[PDB]
Amino acid sequence: KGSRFISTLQVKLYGREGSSARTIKATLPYIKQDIPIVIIFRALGIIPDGEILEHICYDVNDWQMLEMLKPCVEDGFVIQDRETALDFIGKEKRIQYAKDILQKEFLPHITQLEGFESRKAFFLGYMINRLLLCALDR
Amino acid sequence: DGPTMREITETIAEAKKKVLDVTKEAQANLLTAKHGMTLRESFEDNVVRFLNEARD
Amino acid sequence: TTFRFCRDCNNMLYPREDKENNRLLFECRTCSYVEEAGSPLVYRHELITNIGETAGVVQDIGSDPTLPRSDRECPKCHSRENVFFQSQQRRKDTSMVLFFVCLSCSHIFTSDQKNKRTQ
Amino acid sequence: LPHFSKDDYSPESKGFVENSYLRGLTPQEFFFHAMGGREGLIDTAVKTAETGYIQR
Amino acid sequence: EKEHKLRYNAEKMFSTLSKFIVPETIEAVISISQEFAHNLEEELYKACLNVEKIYTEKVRSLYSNLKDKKNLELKAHVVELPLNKLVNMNASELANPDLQEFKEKRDKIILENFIV
Amino acid sequence: LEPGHAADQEQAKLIRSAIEHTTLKSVTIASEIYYDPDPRSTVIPEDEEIIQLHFSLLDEEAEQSFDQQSPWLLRLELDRAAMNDKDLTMGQVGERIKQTFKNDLFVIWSEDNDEKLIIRCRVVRAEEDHMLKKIENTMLENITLRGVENIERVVMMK
Amino acid sequence: SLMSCISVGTDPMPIITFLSEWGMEPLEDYVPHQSPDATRVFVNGVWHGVHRNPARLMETLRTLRRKGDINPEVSMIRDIREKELKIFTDAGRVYRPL
Amino acid sequence: DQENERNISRLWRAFRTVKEMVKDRGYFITQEEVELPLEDFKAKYCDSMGRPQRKMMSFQANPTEESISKFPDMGSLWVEFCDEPSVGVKTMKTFVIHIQEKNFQTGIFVYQNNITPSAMKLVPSIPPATIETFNEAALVVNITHHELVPKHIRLSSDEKRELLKRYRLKESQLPRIQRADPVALYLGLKRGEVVKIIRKSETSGRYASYRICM
DNA sequence: AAGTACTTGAG
RNA sequence: UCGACCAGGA
DNA sequence: CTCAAGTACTTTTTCCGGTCATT
Ligand SMILES: Nc1ncnc2c1ncn2[C@@H]1O[C@H](COP(=O)(O)CP(=O)(O)OP(=O)(O)O)[C@@H](O)[C@H]1O
Ligand SMILES: [Zn+2]
Ligand SMILES: [Zn+2]
Predict the structure, then answer these.
(1) Cis peptide before F101 (omega within 30 of 0)
(2) Phi, psi torsion values for H200, nearest 5 degrees
(3) Fold that domain F9-146 belongs to in CATH
(4) How large is the greatest C-alpha to C-alpha distance in chain B, in angstroms?
(5) Which chains have 3 or more CB–CB distances shorter than 8 Å to chain B?
(6) For chain H, what is the domain count?
(7) Which residue is nearest to nucleotide K14 (CA to C1')?
(8) H-run or E-run covering H144
(9) 3-state secondary structure of D19
(10) In a shared domain, residues H134 and H164
(11) H106-111/H77-81 β-pairing
């Protein structure tokens, strides 16, 4: 109960089986392009790629899944800071706009409040885990 | 007819036992699939076949 | 493959070649960190897969009522207590081999009469 | 159905009606027949316009 | 012209196949292995560049399959089986008697598959 | 089939093989990128016997073209059953790659007899890492080993 | 069907508060590589946190609903092969007695 | 020897079909000439090393006595084959000027892989005469010999004129054969030419249709 | 859903 | 006296 | 200046009482 949010998040796996370097992007409400997941994680707070890895893969004895994450880490690598990630949501105007979308329109169930940035990040990773899970045919 | 019924009932039975055989054999990884089919696809044909032979 | 991360900033490690001493190094592009590669293997493909068949064999596997029980005695503890699933690999191509987990030793053994498996 | 254990490929499990109509159907047999029967009404409805447009 | 230079290296392998010649005595020297090197090397020149590529890998399959043992030891002793036919043989036949068991298994069981 | 071969089941088997389109992808188990800095000597002890019967014999100008080459090696294991069933030889496979990439890629391979079937590749002539990953894509998905393009799963019928 | 009903919709906070007080580690403090077997707990498709031994927690809730303290309509599932525990206070679910 | 002979078989296979095409087109070639064997084929056009020379294969054929009765204006044709897989603008002019001086009415050019877009845009440069391009691989098999392909027959200006009279037809009212059509190409069919197609019927025994060119 | 019939865009 | 939805028939 | 992909468009069987709003 609360208007009844029509917003649906799509987490996509670009490229097919046999296509070199498969990237994972996600469509966020009210921002036209589908931005790489590593940028989202950095925009949420998780900045080192390996803390971002730890959010998707819950086992570090699973190289098959991690190898599938390697190109996505490379894609996101252009942006290394949280503020530089919020900016990559098109200054100061595009940064507050970004800040607002992740709170209000990105995963509005769970919470729309504030500091729950971690909760949304683990959830994002859960979705990405369940995505790569059918990609491996597991 | 009564005896005819027993005859029908055991026709099903002998065909269900014929399935069980092909099932536990395919579980024991001994089956060989006829081209353009998985072991699974090839197995399922046999099941369907024994049970349709049976009904008829 | 089993790749490492750059200490100090836990970022991904990228390869670099030390053409002088002809050895592989793992360089960091989020700083000045470097480290000798252990293995000469940098990347692995694996088209034909054998990993995903024994998927989710938690301790509570024997508690699942939705699972079937059999009479097959254990190869190590020798208990006639079983819970078995089909090859958990969700590919069309997959075979219907059974994977029996014992309700005592909690060790997995198959019905396969072709391969000398140890996983 | 939730009345079966997992990885059951047996005639009974994947919808084999061992019974005659005179004898009567088991609840599981009844439900499986019910799914198969519904497929008939759908195909008659789906492919009836497609066939009609073909004539036109 | 430059082929003759390459032909030299070809003989040098059947010369060590001396190190293959050892278990012929251990069940059922460096001089006859030099003579038997020329027994095959010139016989492969016969098989090749006829009337008027192939050759290079032919020598490999002979060395690799004859090196074998203790499965091809049975096929290697029957050699000292003629050394004339062995040249035009190549591949699936030069294989182990233990391998031509699985080769029969695969080929004879796939014949029941693609015959629908 | 040809009129004078109608019932010859063996003639059919030959065509069956001659038309069914086979890609390297179908006979490969896995591909690996190894950093083997010296071409003459291999870090992999399994590939010891491979370099031996290939460097000695294939002495046909392969010294200056090349004595390196590329330190980055692409190594791929093939399946005996896949190779046997879809009738093939390491020599057959190896020469196709060798004629797809011509003299821009140095190809070597293990013999049919060997317990592990392998094909070793090196570039000829900065960022070569990804440059080689592109070479394996053209090798698995763009190479024809046997048969006619667009033709799949061919079956015999009496 | 004759016996089937549709869930009217319950409140998830009295179960959220229950869970945390019964061994639920909050997601805000999850150490994924330290405890990598941990069963993940979802209340109406909201990942709240994880539980170290799902077996005993499960029966606490199962017997808690059967007692009448958890609403009888509130459906809870234990996916052992997936290490997951989903709970539904949701309005719209069709249930049947057994 | 291995895959050397596969190019050879194919070249001879194509030669036979080109022979058949010219024969069926109306020109004078014998079945004894067509059925020319492979071992004999090699003996004539294969070089000192067994490599076939396509320059030698090139030949001229003249109209049969019966052809001159139906279509008298039908002139002799020249068939050339090139040893260059990619046929240049230099070689094409050597062929084009051959027909222009020798006043040939028609000329078939059999190429290996391709012809320069430069060279191929010199075909209508010599009227009244006409040129026809054909790929070797296409000519390996005589498509006209297939089960499903009935006998198409070229109608004379008068045969055609008569057909339209007797069926009270406008040219449009006739079923059409495309210029690009494999059989239309085999018979060097020109826009407006009519073919009498004799097919076999499960109903009449024999039924004959007609097709106007595109 | 599957054509068509175009723009839009890379090499 | 106008046409939209819904529910039905073979 | 070729050709891959994104863009938009147009179809979807036949006949045969009630209730709503508004014309
Ligand atoms: N949606 C539809 N559109 C057009 N025609 C239909 C139709 N539904 C039924 N019909 C007509 O009705 C005929 C058959 O339908 P029914 O008469 O209701 C079955 P039945 O013949 O009484 O018994 P059966 O079910 O044993 O065949 C069809 O062949 C068709 O002519
Ligand atoms: Zn660093
Ligand atoms: Zn045990």
Answers:
(1) no
(2) -105, 135
(3) Gyrase A; domain 2 (3.30.1360)
(4) 45
(5) C, D, E, F
(6) 2
(7) D52
(8) none
(9) coil
(10) no
(11) parallel
